[PDB]
Amino acid sequence: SEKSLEQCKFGTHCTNKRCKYRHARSHIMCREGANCTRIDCLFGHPINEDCRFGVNCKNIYCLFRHPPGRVL
Amino acid sequence: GSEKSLEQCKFGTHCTNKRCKYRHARSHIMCREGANCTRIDCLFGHPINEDCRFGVNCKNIYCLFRHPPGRVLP
Amino acid sequence: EKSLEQCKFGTHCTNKRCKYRHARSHIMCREGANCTRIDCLFGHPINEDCRFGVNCKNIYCLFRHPPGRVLP
Amino acid sequence: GSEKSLEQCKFGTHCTNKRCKYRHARSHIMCREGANCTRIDCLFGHPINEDCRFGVNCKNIYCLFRHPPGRVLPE
RNA sequence: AAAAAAAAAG
RNA sequence: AAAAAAAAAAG
RNA sequence: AAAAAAAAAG
RNA sequence: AAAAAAAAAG
Ligand SMILES: [Zn+2]
Ligand SMILES: [Zn+2]
Ligand SMILES: [Zn+2]
Ligand SMILES: [Zn+2]
Ligand SMILES: [Zn+2]
Ligand SMILES: [Zn+2]
Ligand SMILES: [Zn+2]
Ligand SMILES: [Zn+2]
Ligand SMILES: [Zn+2]
Ligand SMILES: [Zn+2]
Ligand SMILES: [Zn+2]
Ligand SMILES: [Zn+2]
Ligand SMILES: [Zn+2]
Ligand SMILES: [Zn+2]
């Protein structure tokens, strides 16, 4: 078994039974962000990939990277 | 003929029933026509006919399940 | 919490809280339907009639078939 | 031509990529034309261009992955 | 080769 | 209570 | 980074 | 309301 701190982009809808990444079960973003070192942490951490839906992405819980100028 | 229903699919974009009869939301925006929307292929959110497991204290602002009165969101 | 009842989706089950038994081998369990090992990975019968009936040709199918279906 | 490919999807009926460009088998029967089949919506099984994880010892008679020579199956 | 690249209000 | 996070640590 | 390379009989 | 009751060879 392998375990990484990198965030799984599929979250609770991941269906890879050998997935080595972290999975969020809360819409709350972890208070430590990308600095969190808890392997089984259930809060959200940033995904290192640009959001397909850009500055106009309407999902306030989205963990992908957005341009500046997007207001929550 | 068609067996499709206006009732909302509780799994949304994560439904993997290849024969699902229900409506699927692909937007986080709630449909402006509400539960009265009659467009079978409408992609906006509509209420699900099932009680939310998380009850009056559910804090997911996109949740489409049914909640008791007095639920408060930020 | 866990049940001896066979999961009808096997390795393709995506219920993260599933309480049923999952076959990871196409070999049928030598103890049959009355096997009581909770983590047994061999096949046991599903409690549902096969949609494909007496003419089902999938030799690994665990659903229920009428007696006229004979496997080579 | 179109974006669709004749290459076989390795996930079959359990594929959940809504943008998948590959061919999907809905039968355990292997296509009589094999890897030479050019029908883009063919539902029968064709060889996958990837080595089987279970190698010469694979006993799944419906497996579409590549195997070493010397694999045997029940007769 | 698994995000809603389906846009109608994204 | 057979596919939602009734898994809680801040929900 | 989505096959059962998880084995007890594969 | 998650099996290929979608068929061309099932
Ligand atoms: Zn994952
Ligand atoms: Zn954390
Ligand atoms: Zn986004
Ligand atoms: Zn559905
Ligand atoms: Zn609508
Ligand atoms: Zn709710
Ligand atoms: Zn299951
Ligand atoms: Zn057993
Ligand atoms: Zn069958
Ligand atoms: Zn072209
Ligand atoms: Zn595919
Ligand atoms: Zn073919
Ligand atoms: Zn194989
Ligand atoms: Zn990565």
Numbering used by the authors:
A (entry chain A): 408 to 479
B (entry chain B): 407 to 480
C (entry chain E): 409 to 480
D (entry chain F): 407 to 481
The publication says:
The heterogeneous nuclear ribonuclearprotein, Nab2, a conserved Zn finger protein, is essential for mRNA production and functions in polyadenylation, surveillance and the packaging leading to generation of export-competent mRNPs. nab2 mutants frequently generate hyperadenylation, defects in surveillance, and reduced mRNA nuclear export resulting in nuclear accumulation of poly(A)-mRNA, but the impact on each of these functions often varies between mutants, consistent with the Nab2 protein having several functions in the gene expression pathway. Nab2 functions in this process to control both mRNP compaction that facilitates movement through nuclear pore complexes and the length of transcript poly(A) tails.
Crystals with P21 symmetry that diffracted to 1.55 Å resolution were obtained for the complex of A11G RNA with ZnF567. The asymmetric unit contained two heterotetramers that each contained two RNA and two protein chains. Within a heterotetrameter, each of the two RNA chains bound to both protein chains through interactions that were dominated by the purine rings of five of the bases being buried in surface cavities. In each protein chain, finger 5 bound to A4 and finger 7 bound to A5 and A6 of one RNA chain, whereas finger 6 bound to A10 and A11 of the other RNA chain. The 3΄ G12 did not interact directly with either protein chain, but appeared to contribute to the looping of the second half of the RNA chain that positioned A10 and A11 to facilitate interaction with finger 6. With A4, A6 and A11, a H-bond between Adenine N6 and the SG of a cysteine in the finger was supplemented by the purine stacking on one side against an aromatic side chain while its other face formed putative π interactions with a positively-charged residue. In both cases, the H-bonds required the N6 hydrogens and so could not be formed by guanine O6, accounting for the specific recognition of adenosine by the fingers.
